[PDB]
Amino acid sequence: GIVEQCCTSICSLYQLENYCN
Amino acid sequence: FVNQHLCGSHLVEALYLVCXERXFFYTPKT
């Protein structure tokens, strides 16, 4: 999930946008 | 601002800024 991708590893715009509606 | 470790309120703020009017979902447990 987002925590694994952005908090415990380095986040990216690509990944953040996966969580926009 | 997005290319770093982002946790908690810091992560939610990034989602808010990036997603704009699209909105977003934040699901930390999964």
Side-chain angles (χ1 to χ4, degrees), chain B residues 10-26:
Chain B
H10 301 193
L11 178 49
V12 166
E13 150 178 311
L15 285 165
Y16 170 73
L17 291 172
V18 161
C19 295
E21 292 184 351
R22 295 175 279 182
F24 65 85
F25 64 100
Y26 178 56

Side-chain angles (χ1 to χ4, degrees), chain A residues 3-21:
Chain A
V3 168
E4 289 64 51
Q5 301 316 323
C6 282
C7 173
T8 64
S9 72
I10 300 167
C11 199
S12 65
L13 180 58
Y14 184 101
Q15 287 293 322
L16 285 168
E17 286 201 328
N18 281 328
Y19 300 95
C20 307
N21 300 309

